[PDB]
Design a protein around this ligand. Structure first.
Ligand SMILES: COc1cc2c(cc1[C@H](CN1CCCC1)c1ccc(-c3ccc(C(=O)NS(=O)(=O)c4ccc(N[C@H](CCN5CCOCC5)CSc5ccccc5)c(S(=O)(=O)C(F)(F)F)c4)cc3)cc1)OCO2
Length: 146
């Protein structure tokens, strides 16, 4: 998926004011990402406090985090974490006057989605099943998985 990436990044860049599947998939993913960033605010803040970003290290940083994220397997919340992480990297790139990196990060994200998440997503009911899970309350999400 690639539109999904560009629409996400464009939105995260907006929440900081900086200009760069059905609509309900894109809205739900935005909403789930915002949820993630609130619930894991310490990790978001730690990441910001400890991210050391240059164009020369940007790929290593991107690839290292993503590899740790999915090391024990894929699930929908880690896919949300993936989008949020890339969005933050793009935000931090623009903040540090390295805006060149945004297109690179978008490409890396789209490539990771296509090459390493597409199979899992298809096998787990597609983005339609993501939206279904988001709608269900915590108790109902555990029941559906079980
Ligand atoms: C390297 O790891 C990273 C990378 C990071 C990062 C944080 C991490 C850390 C690593 N830390 C730091 C060092 C090692 C430990 C991290 C890595 C992973 C996670 C994590 C935490 C929880 C889950 C998890 O619950 N996944 S889950 O079961 O599939 C799930 C549960 C609830 C939900 N949605 C629920 C929606 C509730 N609805 C209920 C009814 O009305 C509307 C809302 C709960 S909201 C939520 C959103 C995202 C993630 C977790 C909870 C979802 S979802 O929103 O994706 C949906 F499918 F529903 F659409 C998935 C998955 C991953 C948390 C933190 O920040 C961005 O970059």
């Amino acid at each position: 998926n690639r539109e999904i990436v560009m629409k996400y990044i464009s939105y995260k860049l907006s929440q900081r004011g900086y200009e760069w599947e059905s609509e309900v998939v894109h809205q739900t993913l935005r909403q789930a990402g915002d949820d993630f960033s609130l619930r894991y605010r310490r990790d978001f803040a730690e990441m910001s406090s400890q991210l050391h970003l240059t164009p020369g290290t940007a790929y290593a940083s991107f690839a290292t985090v993503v590899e740790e994220l999915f090391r024990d397997g894929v699930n929908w919340g880690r896919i949300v974490a993936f989008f949020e992480f890339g969005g933050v990297m793009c935000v931090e790139s623009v903040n540090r006057e390295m805006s060149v990196l945004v297109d690179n990060i978008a490409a890396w994200m789209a490539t990771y989605l296509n090459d390493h998440l597409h199979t899992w997503i298809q096998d787990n009911g597609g983005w339609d099943a993501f939206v279904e899970l988001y709608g269900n309350n915590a108790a109902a999400e555990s029941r559906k998985g079980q």
